[PDB]
Design a protein around this ligand. Structure first.
Ligand SMILES: O=c1[nH]cnc2scc(-c3ccccc3)c12
Length: 237
């Protein structure tokens, strides 16, 4: 997968390109991240990348000309078939369904805003889709871009409970007893099918207790329905 990035702070992307599973994906050429910086497309002495909003108020916007030229250059490098994404709080809120959809693209270009964002007409003329990572306010689009890249990278062949839309079950490792708390005996049992069912029941229980709205979005199998009923009965005992 190839991801173009437009950012005033390309070095921030080292966080995903030099570390962990995404870092491995980049080193092994499974994932390519290529950055263009609007600062390199300025022509004035002081390499100005911001500009004043019409109508005044506080805050600056990204300057149109350097940003537009960086986008054009990215598009030219991507060739045909690249979807241009602007990350913003007015975008579609990212969720796992969204990620799986985004992961179908072989090529993406991600535009990272700073200051109060970008001129609305650039969204109209250059941007295909707008996406948010959540209903909170951040200082720039770079962390959101990295969040998206990380999420989609998991779908790239060779890189590696929300799979079934449920919260994860609890996990245990050594030691057997930790501050008086013991590992559930079923996990020490060796009984593969009992363990599978325990994990599924736990996942259903936690989704019900913590995020019951997520259960309304699922069509549970007969086994899931049984396990949920048993977990609800136990909770009510
Ligand atoms: O502030 C946010 N919250 C949630 N998602 C996102 S994606 C991009 C941004 C962003 C932040 C600052 C300026 C321009 C864009 C954002």
């Amino acid at each position: 997968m190839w991801i173009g990035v437009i950012s005033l702070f390309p070095e921030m992307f080292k966080a995903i390109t030099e570390f962990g599973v995404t870092g491995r994906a980049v080193k092994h050429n499974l994932l390519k991240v290529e950055c263009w910086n609007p600062r390199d497309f300025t022509f004035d002495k002081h390499k100005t990348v911001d500009d004043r909003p019409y109508g005044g108020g506080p805050g600056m916007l990204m300057m149109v000309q350097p940003l537009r030229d960086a986008i054009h250059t990215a598009k030219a490098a991507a060739g045909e078939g690249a979807k241009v994404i602007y990350l913003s709080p007015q975008g579609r809120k990212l969720d796992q369904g969204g990620v799986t959809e985004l992961a179908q693209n072989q090529k993406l270009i991600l535009v990272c805003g700073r200051y109060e964002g970008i001129d609305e007409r650039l969204i109209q003329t250059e941007i295909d889709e707008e996406w948010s990572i959540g209903d909170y306010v951040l200082t720039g689009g770079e962390l959101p871009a990295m969040t998206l890249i990380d999420a989609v990278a998991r779908f790239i062949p060779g890189v590696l409970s929300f799979a079934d839309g449920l919260l994860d079950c609890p996990h245990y490792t050594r030691p057997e007893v930790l501050e008086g708390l013991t590992v559930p005996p079923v996990l020490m049992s060796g009984h593969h099918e009992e363990i599978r069912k325990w994990r599924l029941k736990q996942s259903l229980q936690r989704t019900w207790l913590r995020r019951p709205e997520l259960l309304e979005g699922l069509a549970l199998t007969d086994e899931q329905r049984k396990l949920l009923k048993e977990a609800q009965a136990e909770h009510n005992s």
